[PDB]
Write a protein that binds this ligand. Sequence first.
Ligand SMILES: *[C@@H]1O[C@H](CO)[C@@H](O[C@@H]2O[C@H](CO)[C@@H](O[C@@H]3O[C@H](CO[C@H]4O[C@H](CO)[C@@H](O)[C@H](O)[C@@H]4O)[C@@H](O)[C@H](O[C@H]4O[C@H](CO)[C@@H](O)[C@H](O)[C@@H]4O)[C@@H]3O)[C@H](O)[C@H]2NC(C)=O)[C@H](O)[C@H]1NC(C)=O
Ligand SMILES: CCCN(CCc1ccc(Cl)c(Cl)c1)C[C@H](O)COc1ccc(NS(C)(=O)=O)cc1
Ligand SMILES: *[C@@H]1O[C@H](CO)[C@@H](O)[C@H](O)[C@H]1NC(C)=O
Ligand SMILES: *[C@@H]1O[C@H](CO)[C@@H](O)[C@H](O)[C@H]1NC(C)=O
Ligand SMILES: *[C@@H]1O[C@H](CO)[C@@H](O)[C@H](O)[C@H]1NC(C)=O
Ligand SMILES: [Cl-]
Ligand SMILES: [Cl-]
Ligand SMILES: [Cl-]
Ligand SMILES: [Cl-]
Ligand SMILES: [Cl-]
Ligand SMILES: [Cl-]
Ligand code: NA
Lengths: 355, 356
Amino acid sequence: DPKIVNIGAVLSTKKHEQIFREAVNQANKRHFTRKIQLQATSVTHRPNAIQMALSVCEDLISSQVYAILVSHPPLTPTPISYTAGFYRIPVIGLTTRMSIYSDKSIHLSFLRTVPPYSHQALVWFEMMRLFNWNHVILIVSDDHEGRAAQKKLETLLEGPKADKVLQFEPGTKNLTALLLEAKELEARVIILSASEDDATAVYKSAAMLDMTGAGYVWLVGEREISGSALRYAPDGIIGLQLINGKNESAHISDAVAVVAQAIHELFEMENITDPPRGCVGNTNIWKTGPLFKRVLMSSKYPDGVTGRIEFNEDGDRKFAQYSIMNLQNRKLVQVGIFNGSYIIQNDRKIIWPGG
Amino acid sequence: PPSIGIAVILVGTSDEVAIKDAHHLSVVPRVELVAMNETDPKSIITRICDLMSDRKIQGVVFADDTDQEAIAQILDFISAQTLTPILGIHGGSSMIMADKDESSMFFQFGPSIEQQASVMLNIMEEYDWYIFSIVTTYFPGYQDFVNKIRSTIENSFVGWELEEVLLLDMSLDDGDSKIQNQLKKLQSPIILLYCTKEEATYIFEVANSVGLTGYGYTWIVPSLVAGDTDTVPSEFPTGLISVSYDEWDYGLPARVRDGIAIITTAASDMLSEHSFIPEPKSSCYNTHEKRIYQSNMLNRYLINVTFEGRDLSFSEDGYQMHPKLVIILLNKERKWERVGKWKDKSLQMKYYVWPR
Ligand SMILES: *[C@@H]1O[C@H](CO)[C@@H](O[C@@H]2O[C@H](CO)[C@@H](O[C@@H]3O[C@H](CO[C@H]4O[C@H](CO)[C@@H](O)[C@H](O)[C@@H]4O)[C@@H](O)[C@H](O[C@H]4O[C@H](CO)[C@@H](O)[C@H](O)[C@@H]4O)[C@@H]3O)[C@H](O)[C@H]2NC(C)=O)[C@H](O)[C@H]1NC(C)=O
Ligand SMILES: CCCN(CCc1ccc(Cl)c(Cl)c1)C[C@H](O)COc1ccc(NS(C)(=O)=O)cc1
Ligand SMILES: *[C@@H]1O[C@H](CO)[C@@H](O)[C@H](O)[C@H]1NC(C)=O
Ligand SMILES: *[C@@H]1O[C@H](CO)[C@@H](O)[C@H](O)[C@H]1NC(C)=O
Ligand SMILES: *[C@@H]1O[C@H](CO)[C@@H](O)[C@H](O)[C@H]1NC(C)=O
Ligand SMILES: [Cl-]
Ligand SMILES: [Cl-]
Ligand SMILES: [Cl-]
Ligand SMILES: [Cl-]
Ligand SMILES: [Cl-]
Ligand SMILES: [Cl-]
Ligand code: NA
């Protein structure tokens, strides 16, 4: 008999539980599992954060999980990160994109197989080189996500330069003062980070100031061409969609592969201890937790369903693939992809604002 | 006058009798001592939720005898989720949490991060120690610590010289000897350390391996590193200096008294202006639906309470406003020893010159 090593998951549906089950069973098939052999333990999301925390203890940590997969319900991963982090049990985010999960102080054992929204700056930057936009205006919401995008782009720039950064208070509906400050500047290329509703307010104000026509380039991310943002978005706008970013099934499969590889790598080392069994009466960290986190952080899985899987220094997905989308006659049209490191233009012509 | 329920939760050895002894308004407290054995997330959540579904709990006063700073994090989580006032008055429950939730009604006895950092520079100026480095982990607050120092320095006509700031990642194992390589970069004779007690235990063990604990190096840490001063890890270097609120002149009986008063006064003050107080949540299981019916309105009163002509007010950030702090020094017998008070924004030290 082998040593049985539990992996946990908090997932959206029973269907996705079964997928996780089958992924773990496949990992057992394809790995050499005389010594150690994985076992799937899963629940679905609870209705509120306190019940979810309790469930992590009662359902998962009671089974001594070495790691916990967590999907964003479509109520956040946060309670699961908190509770699991208490013990230094690693959490793998499957679909959560918010930049806040990259903060070690808050989420101190958290990796994810999708990138945070802020990493869209990586694509903007390659776009700016490609189309030789050397002077841009950056408009970001004055919240965490907005400031995260700013920091990320400013790091890449510091070739092309930002002529100015403008931040606005989230939830503001008349943005003409801010947008007037951008109109006076010379650069005509405008990059936007904002939630759905805040992008809407921007697009409206920009249209009333006639900043959405010929001359101007608008470069945004995924949130800014989603839901209601899309409904008032100007033609010619360029935006992004994370390929497979919403495919819980794809990420379950990839996350399990990575975690299974990492478990087997872990157990080549000496003096591996088990995680605590249950929460009750246990207040010490899992001593091997920090080691297992390092092994995950450095895991490389080239043959992923979502592409090439590595993690950066914050445990965020690297080599993510984006669709480059262009609003033409009010339809979203793919004009290229960012394949992880390289921009590939397809045969469909970009139509800019105006044209 | 109507009665509000207040749970007083005590973890670990405590004299309940002496407590129930230290203990005019529009409302009147019904106090309820609960003892608790464990301080894991489940035990703490389950205990408080069970309390809230048996009795009608307006507020929670929490004290423990551990060094577990995580207790404060758990309580803030519970407070924000259920919108219930919780005071962490002693132990891990009072170990500063930076960045409490927007909806938190969690308040802690003891100094903010920024105030401790201010005290630490005052100690340095007294003995003309102007050259120093900073070591922190990623423990929440560490940025607020570094920033407070930096902006005090920057705005001073004094010849401060901050030489190095180290950030230590102890979420990963140290089999590459990273922390050792970082520590071996320190030259300064004063080193300010921000981290948890358990983290400092490890950091000191490593610093010693590299010759940084002995003479020529003085380490200064905040309250939560000293923690319970009757528990002194062996790795802690003789000569360690700490700001402390561990329990010197402000005893647990008195703390529980003031805790009960703060919640009671605050509720009275609200009933008097608005002709209602918020109704005790009767469930943690239900907090998602009943949420538009709840707010943290009681906070604005929680923070402006005078009792027995003692100003007990909190900051909006949820720490005590004017704590009398005790500066302590780990002596040759490896006991913690009083060597200073920080009273009225004034530092009063015992020694003009440090003995060894
Ligand atoms: C995203 O898209 C990028 C760009 O297309 C991909 O990166 C390229 O990956 C291909 C592999 O398919 C690489 O192609 C190989 O190039 C080798 C030499 O590369 C040098 O020269 C190129 C061009 O100047 C430089 O870009 C590069 O920096 C190097 O200096 C060749 O030796 C290889 O030839 C081999 O295969 C051929 C075809 O079968 C055989 O005939 C040969 O015998 C030989 O075995 C090959 O052509 C390319 O170098 C990569 N470019 C870059 C910039 O990295 C990414 O792979 C892609 N990402 C994903 C996830 O798909
Ligand atoms: C805003 C902060 C939120 N907090 C959540 C803690 C928590 C909340 C609720 C519960 Cl229910 C539990 Cl269970 C745990 C984060 C947690 O406090 C992080 O803990 C540490 C972070 C960093 C470090 N330093 S490090 C990365 O070098 O090792 C140490 C502890
Ligand atoms: C999601 O990924 C799976 C592979 O795991 C694939 O079979 C399926 O087609 C994908 N779904 C979509 C909508 O592309
Ligand atoms: C806590 O420990 C005390 C002392 O032994 C005991 O009386 C009590 O039953 C314990 N409580 C629980 C919930 O186990
Ligand atoms: C706090 O102290 C008293 C009320 O007790 C009063 O002088 C002051 O205005 C109060 N602050 C408020 C109500 O914000
Ligand atoms: Cl096998
Ligand atoms: Cl449990
Ligand atoms: Cl194209
Ligand atoms: Cl208990
Ligand atoms: Cl919270
Ligand atoms: Cl503290
Ligand atoms: Na991370």
